Amino acid sequence: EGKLVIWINGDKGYNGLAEVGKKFEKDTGIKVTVEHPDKLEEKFPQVAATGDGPDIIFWAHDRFGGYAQSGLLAEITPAAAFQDKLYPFTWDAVRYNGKLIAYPIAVEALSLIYNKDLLPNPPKTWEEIPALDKELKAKGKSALMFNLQEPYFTWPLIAADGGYAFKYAAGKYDIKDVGVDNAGAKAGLTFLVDLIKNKHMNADTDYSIAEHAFNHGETAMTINGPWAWSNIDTSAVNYGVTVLPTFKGQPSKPFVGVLSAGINAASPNKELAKEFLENYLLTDEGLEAVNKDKPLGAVALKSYEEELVKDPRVAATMENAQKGEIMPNIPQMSAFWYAVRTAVINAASGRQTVDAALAAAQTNAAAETVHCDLQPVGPERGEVTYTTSQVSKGCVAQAPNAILEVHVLFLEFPTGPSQLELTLQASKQPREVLLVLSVNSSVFLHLQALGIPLHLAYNSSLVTFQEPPGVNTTELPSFPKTQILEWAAERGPITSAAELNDPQSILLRLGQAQGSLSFCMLEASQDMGRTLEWRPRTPALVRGCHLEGVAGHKEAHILRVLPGHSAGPRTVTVKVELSCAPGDLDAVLILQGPPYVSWLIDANHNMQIWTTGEYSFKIFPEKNIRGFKLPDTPQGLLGEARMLNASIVASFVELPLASIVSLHASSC
Amino acid sequence: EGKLVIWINGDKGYNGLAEVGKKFEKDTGIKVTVEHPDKLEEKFPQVAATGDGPDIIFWAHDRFGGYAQSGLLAEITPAAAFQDKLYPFTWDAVRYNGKLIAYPIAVEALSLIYNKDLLPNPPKTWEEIPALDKELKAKGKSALMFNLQEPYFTWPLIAADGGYAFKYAAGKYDIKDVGVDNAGAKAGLTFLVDLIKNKHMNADTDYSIAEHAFNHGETAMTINGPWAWSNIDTSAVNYGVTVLPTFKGQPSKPFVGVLSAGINAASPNKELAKEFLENYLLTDEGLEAVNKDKPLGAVALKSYEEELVKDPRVAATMENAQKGEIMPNIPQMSAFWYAVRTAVINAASGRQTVDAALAAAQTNAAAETVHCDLQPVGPERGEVTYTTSQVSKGCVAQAPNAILEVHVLFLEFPTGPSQLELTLQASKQPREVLLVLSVNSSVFLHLQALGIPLHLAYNSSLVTFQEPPGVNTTELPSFPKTQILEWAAERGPITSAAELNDPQSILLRLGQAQGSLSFCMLEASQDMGRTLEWRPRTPALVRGCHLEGVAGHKEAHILRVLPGHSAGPRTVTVKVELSCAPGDLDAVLILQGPPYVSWLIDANHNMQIWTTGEYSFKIFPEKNIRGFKLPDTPQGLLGEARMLNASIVASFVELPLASIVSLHASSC
Amino acid sequence: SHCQKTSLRVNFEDIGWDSWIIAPKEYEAYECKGGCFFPLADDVTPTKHAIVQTLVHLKFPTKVGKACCVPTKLSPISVLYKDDMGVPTLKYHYEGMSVAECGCR
Amino acid sequence: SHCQKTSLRVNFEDIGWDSWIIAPKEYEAYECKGGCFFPLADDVTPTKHAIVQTLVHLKFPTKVGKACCVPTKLSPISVLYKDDMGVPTLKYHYEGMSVAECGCR
Numbered sequence A, B: 001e002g003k004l005v006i007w008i009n010g011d012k013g014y015n016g017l018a019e020v021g022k023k024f025e026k027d028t029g030i031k032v033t034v035e036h037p038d039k040l041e042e043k044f045p046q047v048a049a050t051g052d053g054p055d056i057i058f059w060a061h062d063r064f065g066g067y068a069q070s071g072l073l074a075e076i077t078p079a080a081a082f083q084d085k086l087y088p089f090t091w092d093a094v095r096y097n098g099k100l101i102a103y104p105i106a107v108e109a110l111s112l113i114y115n116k117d118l119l120p121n122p123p124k125t126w127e128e129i130p131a132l133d134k135e136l137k138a139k140g141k142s143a144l145m146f147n148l149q150e151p152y153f154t155w156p157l158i159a160a161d162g163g164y165a166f167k168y169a170a171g172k173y174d175i176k177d178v179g180v181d182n183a184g185a186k187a188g189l190t191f192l193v194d195l196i197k198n199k200h201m202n203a204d205t206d207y208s209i210a211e212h213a214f215n216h217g218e219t220a221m222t223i224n225g226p227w228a229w230s231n232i233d234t235s236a237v238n239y240g241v242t243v244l245p246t247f248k249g250q251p252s253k254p255f256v257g258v259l260s261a262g263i264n265a266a267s268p269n270k271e272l273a274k275e276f277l278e279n280y281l282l283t284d285e286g287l288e289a290v291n292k293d294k295p296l297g298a299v300a301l302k303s304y305e306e307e308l309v310k311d312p313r314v315a316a317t318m319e320n321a322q323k324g325e326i327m328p329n330i331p332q333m334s335a336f337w338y339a340v341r342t343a344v345i346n347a348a349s350g351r352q353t354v355d356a357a358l359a360a361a362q363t364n365a366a367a368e369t370v371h372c373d374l375q376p377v378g379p380e381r382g383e384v385t386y387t388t389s390q391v392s393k394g395c396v397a398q399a400p401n402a403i404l405e406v407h408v409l410f411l412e413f414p415t416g417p418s419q420l421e422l423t424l425q426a427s428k429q430p431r432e433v434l435l436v437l438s439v440n441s442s443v444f445l446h447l448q449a450l451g452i453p454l455h456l457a458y459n460s461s462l463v464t465f466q467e468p469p470g471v472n473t474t475e476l477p478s479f480p481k482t483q484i485l486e487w488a489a490e491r492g493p494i495t496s497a498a499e500l501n502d503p504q505s506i507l508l509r510l511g512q513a514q515g516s517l518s519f520c521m522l523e524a525s526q527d528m529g530r531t532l533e534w535r536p537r538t539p540a541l542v543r544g545c546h547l548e549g550v551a552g553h554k555e556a557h558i559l560r561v562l563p564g565h566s567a568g569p570r571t572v573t574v575k576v577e578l579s580c581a582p583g584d585l586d587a588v589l590i591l592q593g594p595p596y597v598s599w600l601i602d603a604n605h606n607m608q609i610w611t612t613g614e615y616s617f618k619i620f621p622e623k624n625i626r627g628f629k630l631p632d633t634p635q636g637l638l639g640e641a642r643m644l645n646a647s648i649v650a651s652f653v654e655l656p657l658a659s660i661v662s663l664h665a666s667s668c
Numbered sequence C, D: 001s002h003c004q005k006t007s008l009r010v011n012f013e014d015i016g017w018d019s020w021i022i023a024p025k026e027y028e029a030y031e032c033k034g035g036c037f038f039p040l041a042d043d044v045t046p047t048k049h050a051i052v053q054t055l056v057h058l059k060f061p062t063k064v065g066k067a068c069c070v071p072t073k074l075s076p077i078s079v080l081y082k083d084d085m086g087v088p089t090l091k092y093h094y095e096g097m098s099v100a101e102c103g104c105r
């Protein structure tokens, strides 16, 4: 049996996708869990770089470039026939540096959705909207309302009068040539700031606000993609979808997105992911299901698209798309978007001027250029093990006066019989404890519970103990995870809970409840503190690269701790073992972490050190040493390695707050 | 084709042996040269240790022990059938330390040969000989005459009354227990000295004198072996052969010899030697021929002996033999014989007293005991090359007023096509020269004659020149070597001549005639001086051994120059090259030579030095160093190596006067 | 006064090395103290050139000097080097800083 | 007075070695002469313990001694040794008799 975790924006047809996952489940017996976290595009890289991540991610192509740039996405190898089943330029959208990284699913382009009843004649130009808003305000309504918090809905104007993100030419993008501070952009954004200043729109309008406004007939117009059409269909609004207005006599040029599906490089189910995506998702019936849940606009599948074009709404999406510009997939897109967002917000709220916000956007957009392409490193080349307190999902709570405390652990391992070492540490002093464990694969378990009045709850068929106990055991019912939590709570309060993926060892300390929290509420990337400390089976996928234009042979090993969710200053231990290392080896260690991380180093040869915060060693342990300010991004750290005259990055890894880490090296 | 050089005492049937060599020649085409040098038993070891020697030697067994003791005799491996064809105790005579060294040919024992006409009743006791001598001296004759210069003819009395050489017991000889100074010996020798003192015999009587005396009827008795019987048969003497008289009522105990044939270890024709000896010499017809030439007494062949016993003379030889004692074959026999000889002579001439001469004989007899058994060393273990001025046979003479000078060179190589480098050096100044060369095997020759009005004489069919000359060449006639010398002399005086065996290179200098000698007369082991200097192809057979009872690993390399025939003081150069020698190697170099030999050493590692005369090196060449007195015998030098705490003798070699020597070592 | 190893505590600031040696502050840098006078001891394992020079000195003290007591073997120490470019170069065995054995040469 | 190699002719009789060194009579046994004062030259390749000790000495000349100019590498010579048993033991490379390079230690 197997599993497929998927991420997709909450505004898309994730239910239909889930149904496709049900067909895939019945056929292959491989369960599919579709989820829609908040800001999943910004969350994915962070977790994927730790080994924990969805098997598949769904998002516009603009981000996949960055993702794979950090070696976070496996290469897609579809047969030429299958590639012929989809349109080329979509593959081009997912192709970056010559490799197909994702499966193009759909095409997305913003369209003007107007209320036919309120506005039978939508405006052809932006310049007339103010007048219309005046009239409709005399009728007790508003002209237009759309999300102003995300710059994706404002770019069509900005680029309408000539704005552009990165000057493209000779098959490649020029990152140092940005067109946000040019005339057209300043003109468009000036027009928007004039709309808000004249109270034709409220600077705080967001997606939900606009959708509610138009769907309830409070505003006569809105700007949205195919997905929103379903929500309008449920509403009593008689809506029309048409081209966007012209600014300064020029058509609005929206950024055309390509909903694509990328495979997590850390996923062991790569084969199965290929199975689902290709053979189930990109078939007529699959895209039929998803589009039934939420319209995908123009799909990348030629057949089903041939059927969808007949929808005049899709046709409009294609007109607006043809008039616009496909988004670049380069990594810098992230920074660009961030900058633009800051600009728009600061200009709409009145914090900054148009010229100022857009100048600053011209400087901030392009930045942290890439220095190399990170590629996975084989185990025999590099190896990492570590012990951390963080968990995929976690909560820690206190139970005053509770005669019985409950602990729940959700474990997930590859499709095979695993081995696990679990040890429960007794607290200082009679409280009886309940341990509910759930697993998605067979497991051989080494349980160690000393002096603990313990009770158990688990699968008698999936779990096999080396030292089994007879009495005080309970068969785990077949419920969803949440219902498992509630069911466990029906016996006693839950003091702690965590979802681990492929753990090697687990240490659970009782009575170590941190702070004052009375209810356990699962939080992604939660810090378990002194409660739980586990060693995962599979570490983050080792990565490395070669820094071009750098003379000599100098090895660079980089370690970057991820944000730690508000904890006191910690000491991270680090052991290094460079096997088959030349007598006089010129290497460097780069330790990046939050400001509250001090480093404790232990190595066996001569090498460079470069850290944040402060660092100490086993030799002369006292007399800590002040660190330096290091770049925060992966490409920033790689660039610092280049500054360190490092020609090769032998190792690159990113972990969360972890007490101990050990690294072994090779490549002789 | 091939060759077989043989040595045998001049008093034996070497002519019949030569005839057997003629049959062997016709059958196998392998010429046989039988020779009878003077003191060939003492000469053989000296030459054989240099590679030059007869293919086969004939002598009593008493010496073969010493010979093989120096590793000079190859092991005999006759089939058990053939061994059954001869009597065992003969094989025992030739067996030494477990190896069959020679082929037993005949049995020799002294017998009393009396003139029946002069003495119809030979005496039964020694004590009556004086009276008989008085009577016969009244008749103008003498009673007895026999060789007094060799102790072999006097031992029968000495041992008659209990004398013995080495006390034998427990299957082995005790060298430190000698019976020459005992009562019986002193009694016998006293009796002899009384015979000479009373003028019954002349102290100067030798073999020839006695044989002449008896054969011409001047004396009535003599003591001789079977060989002499032939010479009596030619004489008009009517002789009888009977047992020897009794001394002090005890029978005379002669030393029974075993005429045996040993194979020179340095001979390449070992196979052919085995052929001749076994299949031709030890057959009925062969022993028939030799015995026809000179009686062999009792032969070792059972058949032919069965026919010879019927000769009453042989029967007498067997009675005297049974009454006597077989000679020990041990090496010490040589020293013993020497001592005894000195004693007898000094006691007969009146120089020493019986008690004194025989006491001194008791001390001198046993001496220079063996320290190890020398065995041939393979080339890959050790290698020697050298350049010498000595030759198997040689002469150098001067030619006053001679318009043409002659040079003759007799060359002999194994049965194969050889290569030779010959260079004639012109003298300072118009004399024309003649070069006569003879060869027993095909040869490819590199002749170098610059500014020499030279003429040639050789085999057009056997010699092949790399640079042949057309005119002034002569075909060499088919003559014996001596007739070749005379024939060459018929054209001009011979200034120099030499017989070389398997030469690699030859240098002949004209006008370098040494001293004042007008006639060239070949002398064995002649010193050619500045005239000739040649590098032999095959060196002396390398030898070594392990010194028992010596702790540690210390290598001993020994070099011993042979006597040099009256020359001025010379400097011998020595180069050493120890390949695959440990960093810190404990070795020693033993350089033995005449008093007129200074040494010049050249080596590449750290080692010990032990020399005679004086020695110098390349480093700090001046400031010669006085040597020490070293033992003269091979066993003496080996014993000195034992004194040097040497546990192994890696190399052992003996060469004649040679200017340069080079040694390469192995065994890692 | 036979040659032997003695203690010598060193401070990197006093020698002006605190700039490119950040760690440690002080360390043990044993010196070789004592006279080299024949007969020379078995543990010193004096070189024969030292023996010779000592005897020649004894013969001509004004024309030839004595043998000297110096380190014959050195050991490494872990230090933190500083490059001109400005990187914290840790050398885990920065050789030739402490004396292991003394002898006369 | 930088440390450097200088000439030193030795006689085996004067040092009492003529008994078990028969050859040669005299030989060249270069000595190391000159002062060790910082800054130390590139050719001397002074050990850092020498540099340190020189600086400490400069700071405390009465409490700590200077670095010493000694041989850092020796070469062999061919000699004729004499064993107690009495054999002429030639050593073709009797090591450690002549100076090859000098340095401060």
Ligand SMILES: OC[C@H]1O[C@H](O[C@H]2[C@H](O)[C@@H](O)[C@@H](O)O[C@@H]2CO)[C@H](O)[C@@H](O)[C@@H]1O
Pocket: A009, A041, A060, A061, A062, A063, A108, A150, A151, A152, A153, A257, A337
């Ligand atoms: O606004 C920043 C955001 O723009 C794009 O996101 C779009 C996405 O393409 C659409 O499919 C839909 O989800 O609306 C999003 C905006 O709310 C970029 O794809 C994304 O990288 C960027 O953050």
Ligand SMILES: OC[C@H]1O[C@H](O[C@H]2[C@H](O)[C@@H](O)[C@@H](O)O[C@@H]2CO)[C@H](O)[C@@H](O)[C@@H]1O
Pocket: B009, B041, B060, B061, B062, B063, B108, B150, B151, B152, B153, B257, B337
């Ligand atoms: O006299 C010393 C001599 O004795 C023996 O020689 C004998 C030999 O055995 C006989 O065959 C015959 O040749 O007479 C010889 C004496 O003239 C020993 O064999 C020999 O070693 C020794 O020198």
Ligand SMILES: *[C@@H]1O[C@H](CO)[C@@H](O)[C@H](O)[C@H]1NC(C)=O
Pocket: A001, A002, A003, A004, A005, A055, A268, A269, A412, A413, A414, A415, A416, A440, A441, A442
């Ligand atoms: C368990 O879930 C993991 C994580 O998605 C998956 O890789 C694995 O195949 C699953 N195993 C089983 C037996 O369902």
Ligand SMILES: *[C@@H]1O[C@H](CO)[C@@H](O)[C@H](O)[C@H]1NC(C)=O
Pocket: A459, A461, A462, A476, A477, A478, A479
């Ligand atoms: C594991 O537990 C689930 C839920 O209780 C159950 O349906 C399943 O059958 C169990 N495993 C096996 C092999 O039965």
Ligand SMILES: *[C@@H]1O[C@H](CO)[C@@H](O)[C@H](O)[C@H]1NC(C)=O
Pocket: B001, B002, B003, B004, B005, B055, B268, B269, B412, B413, B414, B415, B416, B440, B441, B442
């Ligand atoms: C030449 O004589 C040598 C010496 O006896 C012998 O070994 C060789 O076989 C002979 N060769 C020929 C061709 O007669």
Ligand SMILES: *[C@@H]1O[C@H](CO)[C@@H](O)[C@H](O)[C@H]1NC(C)=O
Pocket: B459, B461, B462, B476, B477, B478, B479
């Ligand atoms: C070598 O010379 C001899 C004597 O002159 C002669 O009999 C013989 O035939 C010659 N060799 C050959 C191969 O003819």
